[PDB]
Design a protein around this ligand. Structure first.
Ligand code: HEM
Ligand code: HEM
Ligand SMILES: COc1cc(-c2ccc(N)c(OC)c2)ccc1N
Ligand SMILES: COc1cc(-c2ccc(N)c(OC)c2)ccc1N
Ligand SMILES: [C-]#N
Ligand SMILES: [C-]#N
Lengths: 705, 706
């Protein structure tokens, strides 16, 4: 057989594999060339022209419905972007991971293997100039446009991934198409973007397979909310999408479709579900499936529907009236007709009071329907690309959307080297301690997540809602620090006579850098942190406060903060968050260990601060953590604390949390700790800590990407 | 609560994670600096002095038996080296992987977590200058020396690993201490070095837990053979090792020991089996003076009759009949009290098995023979995965080189320069040898290298010697033709020189392969220059233990599209396994195979996977044609390994292929790689990536230049 993994023997073992994905860029691409530059060479119009031609160029191995592949490509694009979760920013279309397991084999993505295959010739023709990620969304756009609906815009810039995202927790289920995440509709366990394992959002037949529209609406609303969409956006997306195409269920997929791609014979060459059957549900929603119109909303609202069992054995709805009987041409047989159908999830938009009001308004105002759908489709397919700077191409709208967390332009000259050294001196001479400066700079930068490129120190949103009031940021203390930095900003700006100004965003980072350099100096090391001025201060007007709550940490390793709510072990969350900062196991270890010598804990506790000289960057954390002269045990009447007792005297030496101790427990982390805890490794640790600190401070500076 | 793995959803999914380990070197250490350079700065004598002191420095958390930690460290070292398998060269002490799961938590390694912990202070004191891998073996050596026995030598140079070796298949079992690998003793399933999951070699109580010494001997013999040891070496190692220390089994480990390290609470900080020590569950010393080298083990074993019994830990062990041995050994933690010696079923195996008995009787008759065999075997055991002699570092490396080191002769001549290189290259190209013959031969020479134990490679030209010259995959008849031609070129060149310069066949083979690759690239319109490093030498039969090279014989060869008919695993699984031995990443493997198929260097010159109309022309045709949807694939009827690529419209056969070729268009990750190379503007990139990989493989065993 195959070599059994440590994960099998020890299910609770830390999944450091997720951090290993950050140690290098998998794939054959030159680890130095940037996609942005290659996409800039692309003739977008040419690709769009080829896509337009493809829409009606049917291939025998997968005949186009109604002679137009458009709807199939829209479904492909919707599923690509549809896995996005606001909770961690993972999922989504930014890396084109629909191409890799497990997503490529989810029951919900049945036959999208054929859809992606139809695009291979175009991908090969343009090569590196256009990624699969960008191409899949572009195909969706061209499909919509070719069928009569102009899109709001399009931006390239999604770099292809070469493997699945191992950090994503898709759910607790052990089987696809099953759910163990909700008892009552609308109460799905936190963190998940779907109500069923293997589905994009919800079950098309209804919750738990029961055709209950009212209940379905509850799951639709919650899942879409977790994917950053409100009622109007959700109704607009579902109605706009189902205005096109049909569902396929000529017979039961359970007995007529072969294995999914990952389980299919090698000769299938990446394809799966060898037989048209896809979902098991059969029929079109509208009379003209390849034309943009009000057909879906009209069919849904102007007729009464009844639940029935379709030819594929699945729950679907049919109209009572015989007016719609055989009103749609068959998708392949020119001399046959077909009757429209509705899904339980479509009826949900008509039964649910709030959705119903939106739909009725759309029906009365086709223009509003179009406007809302175009804007929602753009948001759906671009929400994980980050700030406007990352949106590339000639089709990028001039308008910047709030979900792009836009940053204002700097209406002033940037400070130079002399000014920089000047400001660093003044910050250190203030009443702010090294610990306060480090903690504040971390609070500002640590919100960044590479999953959807949100967060970071640029914009100084730390000073705005909701961040300024986050428990972990210690609001009271934070205002004091920001107050002092603001006074320095004011004094600096007022003393200039040449148009130069400094942002609070830059001062926060510069202050952190200065404090780290000082901590290193206290230890006898001369280190200089490279600094790149240019960060600006964003305002409340261009900040969707509620949307930033998804960036609130539940566990912060640097500040040794652990929320009492957490269900997962603290170290598990630590690794999860470390991945969002693109950290490797060694980088995370150097960061935490070095930080404990400085001492930047939440509420200034002594947790993990294994040193007698705080604010002095050394490898004392490792030296003391590894000393066998100390024995550790859980603290009494404590939920997160542990005591380090002198093995002999029995006197308390230190106190710590699982965050600190995992580095001396996990086999791999311990090997790293032993390197840093060696007699002649202090300089190395200091330098590695500094490199990681610098890395994190610059994560959201795409001005050089 | 935690993210799932595709491994769980699809058990048959290729484990490409093993190749990913070759893309990056996890750990906080860079790469610009080599461990050898750091070890060179180490004061070996100083470390040994500290180790000698450690031997008698008892820590209260794991008090030394008999006031000397020596035996415990010997066990630690034997277990570190003891996981080695000759089949793939994996396991062993070279990376110190005993420190990581699953090995660190195997039942056979119980309490070695404490042994390794006792060495932490010394490790921290010397830092990067001495690896854990080197330190564990050194501790064993110092322990042996401190107890009265001189070792044969010691070499440093084992670079520490920072994670487990994901490529090792430890066995089919789903539970430690169980076996589903043998129905009859001595008939263990191939590819495994132990008879039980979680054990080093065999069950100390006997096969399947039965105290049958004769049967035990069959498993001991087979497992040690799979770890490169014969009867004399095996008997010497077991008898020599058990001359020291004791087994610990104060009570049943099943209900008195806490979770193994990987499952233990965070506060235990890497330690496990939290409990009158209990380790194996077997209890008692083998000899009267457990911390002194003598003939105590062999004498106790052969001079007295033993009987099986259940010990205080509920395990099988043997007790002496004679009352002369009763209470003859001081208690491990109390010299004022005594204990009776014991023997394991595996020790009685050496007395009951006819062949082992003969060896043991010889050892008892001449202590000097016993001693030398043990010293030589201990050195071999602990250094067999370190590669050739050039990799053995330090002041304690013996002047004598052993055959298991696959030694190489010195070049007693001047090396050829750029002028002669170009000259020889033209001569090879002007010969009647084809591009395919040259590439196939160079590959046959270099492809035997394995990064696991650093054996194999093009240096030495062992391809021309037994057993390689007769391997089916190497096409003996065809090989002789190529070597005959290159040897004539060598003779002609050497005889025409006068400045003392000479060229080796080893270098000519690689030079010829490089010239052929350059020519194939030229046929495609690409001008490539492959860097060549002369200096390889020609090893002779006297430098080659032929039978030991059988272990390097490929069952599947991707470059030559060769698949042995008697393979149990799917061909692509073996392909990945072999790719790992060549330190290849998924992308390097893809570029190598795809590029090779455009050249066409198949076993028996078949057209399998040769998706091009212009063979011997290096292009990306393999990828372009593999990805063309105008072709549909199907298994070839009445064929075990073949598939047909049919024109989707006419049904006419376009190509033939094996799973080695088709996996690059089936596996989700490999397909993503193939799509890059099969794109309109990627041919030049593929050519350069193929050349880079080809060159990398050709130089794998060049450590003197490494
Ligand atoms: C409550 C959410 C949704 C559910 C449960 C759902 C469900 C389904 C199911 C069962 C199918 C049929 C697959 C098949 O048998 O071929 C289908 C297809 C389709 N969906 Fe949705 N969908 C939802 C949302 C959306 C959105 C947000 C869009 C795009 C803006 C979209 C667009 C389409 C298109 C165009 C097709 C037809 C594909 C074709 O003709 O081949 N859907 N959907
Ligand atoms: C047929 C192969 C062998 C078997 C089944 C085996 C078995 C065992 C067992 C069960 C223990 C006791 C662990 C414990 O309870 O503490 C042990 C200890 C020991 N073994 Fe072996 N062993 C074998 C080979 C070897 C070899 C090759 C060496 C070294 C050249 C070695 C050296 C030792 C030493 C020195 C100890 C004593 C450790 C101590 O005092 O703490 N063994 N062995
Ligand atoms: C459980 O019955 C099935 C359902 C689906 C399915 C359901 C909903 C959506 N949205 C979908 O993606 C279009 C596929 C796919 C396959 C089977 N068998
Ligand atoms: C199943 O009962 C056990 C057995 C052993 C065990 C078995 C074989 C050897 N050789 C050993 O020493 C390393 C320990 C260890 C723990 C338990 N419980
Ligand atoms: C599809 N929905
Ligand atoms: C056994 N050692």
């Amino acid at each position: 057989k195959r070599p059994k993994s440590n994960q099998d023997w020890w299910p609770s073992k830390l999944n450091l594999e997720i951090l290993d994905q950050n140690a290098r860029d998998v794939g054959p691409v030159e680890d130095d060339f940037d996609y942005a530059e290659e996409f800039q060479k692309l003739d977008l119009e040419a690709v769009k022209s080829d896509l337009e031609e493809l829409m009606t160029s049917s291939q025998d191995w997968w005949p186009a419905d109604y002679g137009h592949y458009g709807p199939l490509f829209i479904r492909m694009a919707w599923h690509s972007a549809g896995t996005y979760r606001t909770a961690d920013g993972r999922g989504g279309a930014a890396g084109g991971r629909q191409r890799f397991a497990p997503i490529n084999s989810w029951p919900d993505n049945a036959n999208l293997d054929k859809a992606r295959r139809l695009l291979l010739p175009i991908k090969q023709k343009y090569g590196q100039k256009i990624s699969w990620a960008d191409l899949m969304i572009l195909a969706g756009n061209v499909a919509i446009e070719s069928m009569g609906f102009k899109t709001f815009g399009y931006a390239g810039g999604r770099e292809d991934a070469f493997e699945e995202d191992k950090a994503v927790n898709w759910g607790p289920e052990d089987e696809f198409e099953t759910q163990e995440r909700f008892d009552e509709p609308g109460e799905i366990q936190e963190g998940l973007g779907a109500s069923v394992m293997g589905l994009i959002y919800v079950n098309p037949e209804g919750p738990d397979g029961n055709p209950d529209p009212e209940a379905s609406a509850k799951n639709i609303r919650q899942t879409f909310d977790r994917m950053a969409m409100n009622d109007k956006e959700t109704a607009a997306l579902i109605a706009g999408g189902h205005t096109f195409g049909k569902v396929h269920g000529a017979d039961d997929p359970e007995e007529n479709l072969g294995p999914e791609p990952e389980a299919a014979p090698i000769e299938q060459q990446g394809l799966g579900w060898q037989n048209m059957i896809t979902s098991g549900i059969e029929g079109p929603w509208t009379q003209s499936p390849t034309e943009w119109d009000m057909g879906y909303i009209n069919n849904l609202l102007d007729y009464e529907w009844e639940p029935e069992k379709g030819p594929g054995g699945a729950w679907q709805w049919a109209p009572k009236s015989e007016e719609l009987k055989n009103s749609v041409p068959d998708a392949h047989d020119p001399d046959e007709k077909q009757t429209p159908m509705m899904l339980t999830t479509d009826i949900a938009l008509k039964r649910d009071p709030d959705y119903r009001e939106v739909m009725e308004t759309f029906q009365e105002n086709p223009m509003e329907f179009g406007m809302n759908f175009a804007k929602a489709w753009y948001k759906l397919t671009h929400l994980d690309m980050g700030p406007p700077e990352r949106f590339l191409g000639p089709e990028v709208p001039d308008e910047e959307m709030i979900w792009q967390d836009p940053l204002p332009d700097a209406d002033y000259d940037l400070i130079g080297d002399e000014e920089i050294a000047e400001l660093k001196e003044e910050i250190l001479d203030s009443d702010l301690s090294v610990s306060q400066l480090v903690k504040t700079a971390w609070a500002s930068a640590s919100t960044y997540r590479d999953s959807d490129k949100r967060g970071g120190a640029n914009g100084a949103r730390l000073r705005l809602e909701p961040q300024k009031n986050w428990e972990v940021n210690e609001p009271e203390q934070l205002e004091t620090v920001l107050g002092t930095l603001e006074n320095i900003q004011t004094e600096f700006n007022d003393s200039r006579s040449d148009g130069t100004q400094v942002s609070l965003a830059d001062l926060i980072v510069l202050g952190g850098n200065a404090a780290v350099e000082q901590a290193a100096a206290n230890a006898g090391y001369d280190v200089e942190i490279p600094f790149e001025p240019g960060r600006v201060d964003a305002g409340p007007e261009h900040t969707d406060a509620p949307s930033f709550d998804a960036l609130k940490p539940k566990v912060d390793g640097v500040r040794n903060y652990i929320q009492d709510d957490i269900t997962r072990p603290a170290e598990e969350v630590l690794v999860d968050n470390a991945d969002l900062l693109n950290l490797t196991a060694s980088e995370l270890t150097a960061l935490i260990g070095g930080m404990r010598s400085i001492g930047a804990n939440y509420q200034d506790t002594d947790l993990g601060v294994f040193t007698d000289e705080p604010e002095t960057l050394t490898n004392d954390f490792f030296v003391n953590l590894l000393d066998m002269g100390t024995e550790w045990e859980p603290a009494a009447d404590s939920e997160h604390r542990y005591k380090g007792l002198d093995r002999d005297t029995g006197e308390v030496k230190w106190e710590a949390t699982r965050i600190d101790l995992i580095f001396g427990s996990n086999d791999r982390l311990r090997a790293i700790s032993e390197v840093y805890g060696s007699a002649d490794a202090e300089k190395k640790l200091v330098h590695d800590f500094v490199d990681t600190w610098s890395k994190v401070m610059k994560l959201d500076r795409f001005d050089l990407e």
